[PDB]
Amino acid sequence: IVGGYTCGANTVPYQVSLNSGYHFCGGSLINSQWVVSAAHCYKSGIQVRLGEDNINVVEGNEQFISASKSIVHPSYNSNTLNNDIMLIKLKSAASLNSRVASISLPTSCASAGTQCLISGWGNTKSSGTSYPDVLKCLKAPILSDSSCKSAYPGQITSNMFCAGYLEGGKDSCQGDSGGPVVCSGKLQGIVSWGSGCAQKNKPGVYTKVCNYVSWIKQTIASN
Ligand SMILES: NC(=[NH2+])c1ccc2[nH]c(-c3cc(CC[NH3+])cc(-c4ccccc4)c3[O-])nc2c1
Numbered sequence: 001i002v003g004g005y006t007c008g009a010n011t012v013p014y015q016v017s018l019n020s021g022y023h024f025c026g027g028s029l030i031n032s033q034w035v036v037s038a039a040h041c042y043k044s045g046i047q048v049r050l051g052e053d054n055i056n057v058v059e060g061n062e063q064f065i066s067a068s069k070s071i072v073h074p075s076y077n078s079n080t081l082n083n084d085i086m087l088i089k090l091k092s093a094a095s096l097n098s099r100v101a102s103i104s105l106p107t108s109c110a111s112a113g114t115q116c117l118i119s120g121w122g123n124t125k126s127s128g129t130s131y132p133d134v135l136k137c138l139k140a141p142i143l144s145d146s147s148c149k150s151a152y153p154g155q156i157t158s159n160m161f162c163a164g165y166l167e168g169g170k171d172s173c174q175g176d177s178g179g180p181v182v183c184s185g186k187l188q189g190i191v192s193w194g195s196g197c198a199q200k201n202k203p204g205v206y207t208k209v210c211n212y213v214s215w216i217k218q219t220i221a222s223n
């Protein structure tokens, strides 16, 4: 997260860290045994870390659970990042409390101007890499489809939306991918891509979760 602030330990109880010997993507806890993340974060050998704040130090509240399976959307296209979503089933269920809790899925899509909270342990520099030890937060608004389309012509599908600041300086970045975009207490987006990080007129692009609610429920129900 570039231009954000320190969230405060465990203030984002549904945030998870995907680890393969180092932190590589974020994710969101939607039930005690399932996490939602981005399809391009897929790999084998994933350990899900819940209740984290400082990813380099065990401080208490953490729960490390191996992933039993990962389900990448069947229509995911690695060239356009259309349908950039994945579900991960945990080997055992997490113990939910005030420090580890799930987030709710939306019942309707959100509109432009809605203000959301984006968090993660991704790069904090738009120019060079500096990855933090603690969880960073950023409040950003959903932009209009015309502003998004104008910014990335021919690259935005109906399963994506832009959020951020066209003036640059604030945005999600590499390492934040697969993490949550929460608006009014509902999971509306998944950090997916962008052209660089926090550049002017190049806002972040997020997977539009409201378009996958039925898929998510159907898939969890059959696995
Ligand atoms: N400006 C943004 N809002 C933004 C958001 C998420 C991003 N994720 C990435 C990203 C960039 C790279 C390096 C490509 N030269 C790699 C990954 C990546 C991470 C994990 C696994 C595979 C690729 C990214 O998610 N850039 C990003 C930029």
Ligand SMILES: [Ca+2]
Residues within 6 Å of the ligand: 052, 053, 054, 055, 056, 057, 058, 059, 060, 062
């Ligand atoms: Ca820790």
